[PDB]
Subunit: 116 residues, 2 copies
């Protein structure tokens, strides 16, 4: 076995792909068609925040999608915030890259699983 | 799709630089790396941020490789760069390299290699 645990360090490091993608999504032009993103995170992880009413319906994991219906994406180095609609209702979420568990871009079938 | 407009391979490749940062933090701990893990780190000598003994650097104004095994100390894997003292021909010297200057990383013990864009 590997006492260095590279497979695990590589996995945690790859969380940075999500950060870079959102950086592109927030720059002029947004995501290049037809790219869109599935992001899954632990609802109760430290730092995630949003409406209690919404988060309560998602006990542990929640998946959001960035395609067209999203506003004010703010991707920082530790967490990102974005506005999405739920039941047609706009709601603000902030989730740390550390709380992520999955990343998927259907366009090119790019996938990333995280420990979290 | 004839093309990935998001360039995930490039962003992934760049994000893995964090593997090196994570490895150096384990090495900076008392007890260092678990035997027989030794690390080869290659960086671009002229990239911004790179600093050390001019004489030494000048010996290779291109890509230089340093190995971290036993004779290294005061390794500081900061946020955007790391500083470390190594012995070149016996004389200890400080090296400062930004993670963005890394062009390669390699640990023979488990055959784990990574290469990054110049």
């Amino acid at each position: 076995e590997d006492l260095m645990q590279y497979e695990a360090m590589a996995q945690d490091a790859l969380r940075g792909v999500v950060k870079a993608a959102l950086k592109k999504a927030a720059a002029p032009g947004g995501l290049p068609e037809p790219h869109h993103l599935y992001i899954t995170f632990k609802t109760k992880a430290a730092g995630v925040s949003g409406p209690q009413d919404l988060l309560s319906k998602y006990p542990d994991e929640m998946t959001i999608v960035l395609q067209h219906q999203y506003w004010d994406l703010a991707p920082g180095e530790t967490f990102f915030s974005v506005t999405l609609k739920f039941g047609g209702q706009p709601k603000r979420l902030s989730v740390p890259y550390a709380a992520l568990t999955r990343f998927y871009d259907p366009s090119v079938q790019f996938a990333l699983q995280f420990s979290a």
